[PDB]
C-alpha cells in the first residue's frame, strides 16, 4: 500500500535498520519503526461455481433432522452455502430438489 | 446474454407463427404464392414479411446496438431491453413502418449494401493470388498432374 511522509510527502520505502524494519523516506531523515504486525489484504475474485455443482456433485452439507423442502415436504433435496465472490461476502443459501416426476430449482 | 437468447426466441416465434397464418389464408392464384411455389422469384419469408410481420432487424447477428448512452435512440428509456426498443418491427410492409422501425430496418439494410461494396476488394485480390499459384498445373498424357518445371 502507498504510505507517504508527513514531512515532505514523497513516497516511503520499507528498509531495515539496526533494531527494526522501517518505513523510510528517500529525501528526508524521516523513518517509522515497524513495532507491531501490520497487514494489507487483497481479496481477489474466485472462479464461478454455478456450473460446478450442477449434475450430481459431491455435496455434503446435509445433516440429521434437516428440514424438508417447502414444495414436496420431503427431505429428498440437497442444500449448501457458498461464497460466490471473495470470503468477505456473507454466504448465500441455495437448494435443489430432485424427486420422481418432479424437477425444480429454488432459492 | 441469456436474456437476449430468450427474447430472440420469443420474437422468432411471432414471425414464424404469423407467417404460417398468412399462407393458410392466401388463396391459390395469389401471384406471390405462385412465384414462391414454383421458385421463380421470392420465398415464403418474403410473402410473410410483406403481409404478416417484418422480422427482428439484426445488425452483425445481434439486436440493435446502443448508439446513444445506454439506449438505441432517445425515444426509448435507458437500459430498456423491450422488443421495439431494440429493432423488432411489428409492422409489415403493407401496414407501413413507423419512424423508429424504419430507421432500424434501414440500419440492417445498409450492412448488405456495404458488404457488396466491400466484396469486390475483399475477393478479387484473393483470386489473383490463387491463379498465379495454380495456373501452371496441367493434366498430362501419362495421367499425372505436373508443374511447368
Amino acid at each position: 500500500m502507498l504510505l507517504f511522509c508527513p514531512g515532505c510527502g514523497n513516497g516511503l520505502i520499507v528498509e531495515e535498520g539496526q533494531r527494526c524494519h522501517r518505513f523510510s523516506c528517500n529525501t528526508c531523515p524521516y523513518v517509522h519503526n515497524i513495532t507491531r504486525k501490520v497487514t494489507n489484504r487483497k481479496y481477489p475474485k474466485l472462479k464461478e461455481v454455478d456450473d460446478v455443482l450442477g449434475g450430481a456433485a459431491a455435496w455434503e452439507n446435509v445433516d440429521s433432522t434437516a428440514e424438508s423442502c417447502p414444495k414436496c415436504e420431503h427431505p429428498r433435496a440437497y442444500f449448501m452455502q457458498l461464497q460466490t465472490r471473495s470470503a468477505d461476502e456473507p454466504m448465500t443459501t441455495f437448494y435443489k430438489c430432485c424427486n420422481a416426476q418432479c424437477g425444480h430449482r429454488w432459492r | 446474454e441469456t436474456l437476449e437468447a430468450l427474447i430472440l426466441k420469443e420474437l422468432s416465434v411471432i414471425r414464424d407463427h404469423a407467417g404460417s397464418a398468412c399462407l393458410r389464408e392466401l388463396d391459390k392464384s395469389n401471384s406471390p404464392l405462385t412465384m414462391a411455389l414454383c421458385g421463380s422469384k421470392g420465398s415464403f419469408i418474403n410473402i410473410s414479411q410483406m403481409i404478416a410481420c417484418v422480422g427482428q432487424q439484426a445488425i452483425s447477428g445481434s439486436r440493435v446496438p446502443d448508439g446513444f448512452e445506454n439506449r438505441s435512440l432517445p425515444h426509448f428509456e435507458k437500459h430498456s431491453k423491450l422488443p421495439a426498443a431494440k429493432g423488432f418491427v411489428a409492422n409489415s410492409f403493407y401496414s407501413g413502418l413507423t419512424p423508429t422501425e424504419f430507421f432500424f430496418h434501414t440500419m440492417a439494410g445498409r450492412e448488405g449494401l456495404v458488404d457488396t461494396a466491400v466484396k469486390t476488394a475483399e475477393t478479387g485480390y484473393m483470386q489473383r493470388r490463387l491463379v498465379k499459384s495454380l495456373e501452371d498445373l496441367c493434366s498430362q498424357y501419362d495421367l499425372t498432374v505436373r508443374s511447368s518445371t
Binding site: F4, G11 | F68, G109, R110, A117
Partner: protein, 764 residues
C-alpha cells in the same frame, strides 16, 4: 383518455425553411466570413514593419468586400450579373478595398480605398446582386428564382465547396491501440498551433508522447516539471481509490529510480530529450507552456490548470483498463462540420500573411539601398497574390496551406445540372474524413446518432457508400459564439475554482467537473440544479440558444459546448405531459401575428444537439408522451432528406430500394430552370413534355419540385407480356412514343477562343 393532438404542428417546418436549412447553411457561413472574420484576420495582422530602417510603418484600419464588378479593356467598369459570368467564362468577384495609414516622411499619410484583390462572391449571399430581388427582376438578370445559390462561379464553371466532416478538436479520446493497450489523446488545435499528445501504458507505466520529444517520457517527471513535486499531490489528483493507486504505483517507482525529485532536475531531464529545431531548462519550460497540451492556458508560467487536465487524462486511462469503455469516433456529437466560410477564412489568412511578407521584403530591399525619396508601398501593392490565390484554390480544389500543414484535395466539385434535384441535392452533401482509404465497414454503417440530422437512405451505392451523406430537411449548423456570458453565468451558478482545492475532490462521488470546449472551468456539487438553471437561462434568451449543455454521469463531467459546426435540430418543449405549442399559437402563426423566432423566445421550441438529446426523452407523437418526456418531435417525415422526399410511401418499401431512387432521381431528365434556354452548358438534357407527379410528398411542395418536374405519368399494366421483359426489361407502346412519351432533347456545347499573342499577331 387519449392525449389530444395539435394537427397544425407541421406548419413550424415552412416557417423554419424561410430562415434556416435548405442551402441557407452555405449562405450563413459565407456571410459570417465576409462581414466579421475578414476583419479579425486584418486585426491580427494590422501592422507591418521593415526590420531594416525602423520608425516607418504601414497600418491597416479597416477592410471592405464591396459589390461585383468587371474590369474591361479601356478601364471602364460596370456591375455584372451571375449569368454574364457563365457565358463569357469569367469569375464573379467583388474588389477587396482596404484603407491604410502609412509614412512618406510625414508620419501619417492615409488612403481610404486601396484595392488589394478580388473576392469570389457566392450566389445569394449579402453582396450578390440577386439577393432581395423579386421574380420579375430575376428575369432581367437571366436567373431562376428556384436556383439555390450557395455556389461560386470561377472562370465560368459553377463550383460548390462541399461540407467537410471533421473530428472535434480539444477533446480527450480514450481508445485502444493496435496492440490492445488502452491510451488517450487530445488533438489540441488552437489558432496558433495544432498538435497531438498521447498517454501510453506501454509497460504498465504511464508515458507522455509528443513529436517534439525524441523519446516518450514518464508522466511523473512531467508532473514534477510542472511544479507539483510531492508524490502525494500527484496521487491525490490521479485518484485515491485503492485500485487506482495500485495501477499508478509502478509509475512512482520509475521516477524514484532516477534522481528526479525537483522541478529543476525534471526540466533538465526533458531538455536532454527535446529534438532541436539557453538549452536544457528553457527549451523544456517553454515547451510545456506552449506546445504540449497547448489548448490549456498557462498565464504566467503557472502550471496548476494544466496539471488538473493531465490528471483527468491519466484517470480515464486507468478506469478504461478495468472495463473497456473505449470511445467510438462514430458518435456524431464528436463530429464537427466545416462549411464554405470556415475554409475560406484559412485560405485568406495564408494569402494575407504572404502578402504582408512579400511587401515587407520589398521594403527591406529598397529602403537601405535605393534612394533618399521615402518610397510609398502603394506602388508595390500588386493585386495578383490575392486574386489568383482565391481563384486557383476554388477552381482546382486543392487547399495546400503550409502554415497549418493542411493538404486537402477534392474540396470543390462542379455543380451538377442533370436535373433540379441534382443541383439541390449536391448543396446538402457531407464528404467524410477517411475518403475511401480502405474498406473499414465501421463509419460506413448507419449510426443511430444520425437521427434527424443526416438522411438514412440518401447515400451512394458503390465505393463511396456511407462516406458521402446528405443533410435532413430540418437541420442547422451552428456558428462560433462570443463565449463571454457563458463564463460569467457559470461562475454564479456555484462553480468553484479548481485552483482553490487539492487533487482529492476529483475522486469524490458528489463532485462533477464542468468543461467548456475542453477547458476546465471548475467543479460543482448538485449538477442537476446547474443543468436545469442553464437551460432556463437559455430559454429566456440570456444565453444564446445554440449553446448546448449535457451531463456524463459515467465519467462525472458536465459539458458546455459553444463551438461552431455541430448539428442542431428543433423540438417542441414538453412540460408535465403537455406540449407547450397549443392550437392557439399555430393559428397565430398562419395569420402572421408571430414567426418562428417567437417560438424560441416564449420557450415553446428549443434547439437540441446530439450531445444533449442523449439526456432528453423525445416523444415521436403526442400519444406516446409518458411521465418522463422532455421534448416532442415536430415532423417525423423530416428524418428523410431532399432526394428521398420524392419517393411516395417509402415506409412501405424495402430499404435498399429507397437508396437506389436517391441515385436514379438525380439522373432523371427534366427541367433545369426558367433560364434553361438562355443557358449554354457543356451538356444539358431536357424532357419535352414534363408532367408533375400524380402522387406527391409534402417535401415535393416545400422544394417546389412540381414547378419544374422531371417525369411523365405512364399508364402501367402490371403483367407478363411477350417474354422480352424477363429481367427488369419493360415493354413500351409504339403509339405512345409517336405521340411524345419520353421525347427528349440533348444539348451540347462547342466553344472556340481566338487570342491575341504577345507578338502583334492574332487568330482569325
Amino acid at each position: 383518455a387519449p392525449i389530444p393532438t395539435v394537427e397544425e404542428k407541421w406548419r413550424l417546418l415552412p416557417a423554419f425553411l424561410k430562415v434556416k436549412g435548405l442551402v441557407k447553411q452555405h449562405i450563413d457561413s459565407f456571410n459570417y466570413f465576409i462581414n466579421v472574420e475578414i476583419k479579425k484576420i486584418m486585426k491580427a495582422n494590422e501592422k507591418v514593419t521593415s526590420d531594416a530602417d525602423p520608425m516607418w510603418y504601414l497600418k491597416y484600419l479597416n477592410i471592405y468586400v464591396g459589390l461585383p464588378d468587371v474590369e474591361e479593356s479601356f478601364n471602364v467598369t460596370r456591375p455584372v450579373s451571375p449569368h454574364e459570368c457563365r457565358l463569357r467564362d469569367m469569375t464573379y468577384s467583388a474588389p477587396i478595398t482596404v484603407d491604410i495609414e502609412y509614412t512618406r516622411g510625414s508620419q501619417r499619410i492615409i488612403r481610404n480605398a486601396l484595392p488589394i484583390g478580388r473576392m469570389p462572391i457566392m450566389l445569394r449571399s449579402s453582396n450578390c446582386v440577386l439577393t432581395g430581388k423579386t421574380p420579375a427582376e430575376f428575369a432581367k438578370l437571366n436567373e431562376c428564382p428556384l436556383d439555390p445559390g450557395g455556389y461560386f462561379i470561377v472562370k465560368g464553371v459553377e463550383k460548390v465547396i462541399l461540407i467537410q466532416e471533421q473530428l472535434s478538436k480539444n477533446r480527450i479520446i480514450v481508445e485502444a491501440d493496435r496492440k490492445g493497450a488502452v491510451g488517450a489523446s487530445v488533438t489540441s488545435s488552437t489558432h496558433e498551433k495544432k498538435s497531438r499528445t498521447n498517454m501510453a501504458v506501454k509497460q504498465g507505466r504511464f508515458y507522455l508522447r509528443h513529436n517534439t520529444l525524441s523519446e516518450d517520457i514518464p508522466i511523473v517527471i512531467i508532473f514534477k516539471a510542472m511544479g507539483v513535486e510531492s508524490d502525494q499531490e500527484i496521487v491525490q489528483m490521479i485518484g485515491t481509490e485503492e485500485h487506482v493507486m495500485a495501477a499508478f504505483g509502478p509509475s512512482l517507482e520509475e521516477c524514484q529510480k532516477a534522481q528526479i525529485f525537483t522541478q529543476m532536475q525534471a526540466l533538465k531531464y526533458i531538455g536532454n530529450k527535446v529534438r532541436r529545431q539557453k538549452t536544457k531548462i528553457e527549451e523544456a519550460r517553454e515547451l510545456l507552456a506552449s506546445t504540449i497540451l497547448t489548448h490549456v492556458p498557462v498565464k504566467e508560467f503557472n502550471f496548476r490548470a494544466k496539471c488538473i487536465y493531465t490528471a483527468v487524462m491519466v484517470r480515464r486511462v486507468i478506469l478504461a483498463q478495468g472495463d473497456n469503455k473505449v470511445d467510438d469516433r462514430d458518435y456524431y456529437g464528436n463530429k464537427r462540420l466545416e462549411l464554405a466560410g470556415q475554409l475560406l477564412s484559412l485560405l485568406f489568412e495564408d494569402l494575407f500573411k504572404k502578402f504582408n511578407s512579400e511587401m515587407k521584403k520589398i521594403a527591406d530591399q529598397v529602403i537601405p539601398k535605393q534612394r533618399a525619396a521615402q518610397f510609398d508601398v502603394v506602388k508595390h501593392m500588386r493585386q495578383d497574390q490575392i486574386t489568383n490565390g482565391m481563384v486557383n484554390a476554388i477552381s482546382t480544389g486543392n487547399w495546400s496551406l503550409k502554415r497549418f500543414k493542411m493538404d486537402r484535395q477534392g474540396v470543390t466539385q462542379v455543380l451538377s445540372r442533370l436535373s433540379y434535384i441534382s443541383a439541390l441535392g449536391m448543396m446538402t452533401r457531407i464528404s467524410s474524413q477517411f475518403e475511401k482509404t480502405r474498406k473499414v465497414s465501421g463509419p460506413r454503417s448507419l449510426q443511430p446518432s444520425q437521427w434527424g440530422m443526416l438522411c438514412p437512405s440518401d447515400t451512394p451505392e458503390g465505393e463511396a457508400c456511407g462516406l458521402v451523406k446528405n443533410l435532413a430537411l430540418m437541420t442547422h449548423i451552428t456558428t462560433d459564439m462570443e463565449d463571454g456570458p457563458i463564463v460569467k453565468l457559470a461562475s454564479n451558478l456555484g462553480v468553484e475554482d479548481v485552483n482553490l482545492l487539492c487533487g482529492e475532490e476529483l475522486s469524490y462521488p458528489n463532485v462533477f467537473l464542468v468543461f467548456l470546449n475542453g477547458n476546465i472551468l471548475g467543479v460543482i456539487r448538485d449538477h442537476k440544479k446547474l443543468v436545469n438553471t442553464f437551460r432556463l437561462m437559455r430559454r429566456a434568451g440570456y444565453i444564446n440558444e445554440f449553446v448546448s449543455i449535457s451531463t456524463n454521469l459515467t465519467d462525472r463531467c458536465v459539458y458546455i459546448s459553444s463551438d461552431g459546426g455541430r448539428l442542431c435540430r428543433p423540438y417542441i418543449i414538453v412540460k408535465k405531459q403537455k406540449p407547450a405549442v397549443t392550437n392557439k399559437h399555430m393559428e397565430e402563426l398562419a395569420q402572421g401575428y408571430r414567426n418562428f423566432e417567437d417560438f424560441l423566445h416564449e420557450s415553446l421550441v428549443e434547439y437540441l444537439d446530439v450531445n444533449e438529446e442523449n439526456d432528453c426523452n423525445i416523444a415521436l407523437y403526442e400519444h406516446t408522451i409518458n411521465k418522463d418526456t422532455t421534448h416532442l418531435e415536430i415532423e417525423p417525415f423530416t428524418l428523410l432528406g431532399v432526394c428521398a422526399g420524392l419517393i411516395p410511401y417509402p415506409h412501405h418499401n424495402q430499404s435498399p430500394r429507397n437508396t437506389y431512387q436517391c441515385a436514379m432521381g438525380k439522373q432523371a431528365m427534366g427541367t433545369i430552370g426558367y433560364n434553361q434556354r438562355n443557358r449554354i452548358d457543356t451538356l444539358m438534357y431536357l424532357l419535352a413534355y414534363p408532367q408533375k407527379p400524380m402522387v406527391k410528398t409534402k417535401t415535393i411542395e416545400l422544394i417546389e419540385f412540381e414547378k419544374l418536374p422531371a417525369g411523365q405519368n405512364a399508364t402501367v399494366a402490371v403483367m407478363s407480356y411477350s417474354g422480352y421483359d424477363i429481367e427488369d426489361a419493360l415493354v413500351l407502346n409504339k403509339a405512345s412514343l409517336d405521340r411524345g412519351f419520353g421525347r427528349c432533347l440533348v444539348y451540347k456545347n462547342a466553344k472556340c477562343t481566338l487570342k491575341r499573342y504577345t507578338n502583334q499577331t492574332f487568330d482569325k
